[PDB]
């Protein structure tokens, strides 16, 4: 998979997970989250070679088209695959509460 | 929507549907399809401004992050949204048959 272990080994031009830490107050302007101060959101970026696409007929027809006619490219797009939640601390008045924020973290990537 | 009527008006740098005709024999090497000789598959391509992403928390957090910190971009990806089937003619020996090939055509685009 295009995850931390495979992708964080070196810098790669191809579709891969990229490290990113987001500080809620500083980078999002979210003051409602008291803890943690930030988290490793990560993101997906990089070139998609033509055979890296699947799960849709249009994508596999497009991949086959591209492999035969490269010069006239319609290159696939590096997108998120596995997403994970994050537990945070917020307040209801003076009472500290905890809740899960869904799909905050990207763990792996794929080509569209 | 980022469909033919909106997108085929002019050339646009931003995420939009792009016209593409694929000839089965000539461009795919598919000799099994006798009719039609090709079809308008189309494809999605172009720049995604930061607020064009939705449906995932990670995508909206990433869009918000990007709007605040543009220079340090993790730009969204222009992908297919609505897909349509195509009916074709093939043979089982000397008998002509027809069948639907699913999700062959892209009708609209979206930003990841």
């Amino acid at each position: 998979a295009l995850d931390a272990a495979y992708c964080f080994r070196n810098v790669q031009d191809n579709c891969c997970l990229r490290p990113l830490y987001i500080d809620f107050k500083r980078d999002l302007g979210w003051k409602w989250i008291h803890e943690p101060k930030g988290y490793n959101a990560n993101f997906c970026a990089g070139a998609c070679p033509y055979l890296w696409s699947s799960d849709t007929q249009h994508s596999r027809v497009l991949s086959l088209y591209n492999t035969i006619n490269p010069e006239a490219s319609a290159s696939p797009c590096c997108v998120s695959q596995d997403l994970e939640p994050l537990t945070i601390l917020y307040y209801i008045g003076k009472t500290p509460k905890i809740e899960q924020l869904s799909n905050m973290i990207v763990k792996s990537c794929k080509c569209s």
Side-chain angles (χ1 to χ4, degrees), chain A residues 14-55:
Chain A
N14 285 344
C15 176
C16 240
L17 186 73
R18 313 282 158 173
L20 176 69
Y21 173 92
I22 294 182
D23 181 298
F24 295 111
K25 292 185 207 279
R26 197 192 65 219
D27 311 313
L28 293 185
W30 287 359
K31 296 170 170 277
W32 66 280
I33 303 169
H34 294 71
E35 292 304 339
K37 311 313 288 176
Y39 77 112
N40 293 60
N42 304 331
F43 67 97
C44 300
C48 281
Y50 303 129
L51 243 228
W52 286 40
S53 112
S54 55
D55 206 45

Side-chain angles (χ1 to χ4, degrees), chain A residues 28-103:
Chain A
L28 293 185
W30 287 359
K31 296 170 170 277
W32 66 280
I33 303 169
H34 294 71
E35 292 304 339
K37 311 313 288 176
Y39 77 112
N40 293 60
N42 304 331
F43 67 97
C44 300
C48 281
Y50 303 129
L51 243 228
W52 286 40
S53 112
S54 55
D55 206 45
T56 66
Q57 265 271 88
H58 180 270
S59 284
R60 79 175 173 178
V61 158
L62 222 60
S63 302
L64 183 66
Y65 177 87
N66 283 328
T67 300
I68 293 175
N69 309 281
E71 57 281 331
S73 46
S75 45
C77 237
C78 186
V79 294
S80 53
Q81 180 185 246
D82 303 327
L83 309 166
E84 287 311 310
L86 178 80
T87 301
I88 62 90
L89 179 71
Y90 72 102
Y91 286 82
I92 295 175
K94 280 82 205 167
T95 312
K97 303 279 186 201
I98 60 161
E99 67 176 19
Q100 276 203 343
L101 297 192
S102 306
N103 303 321

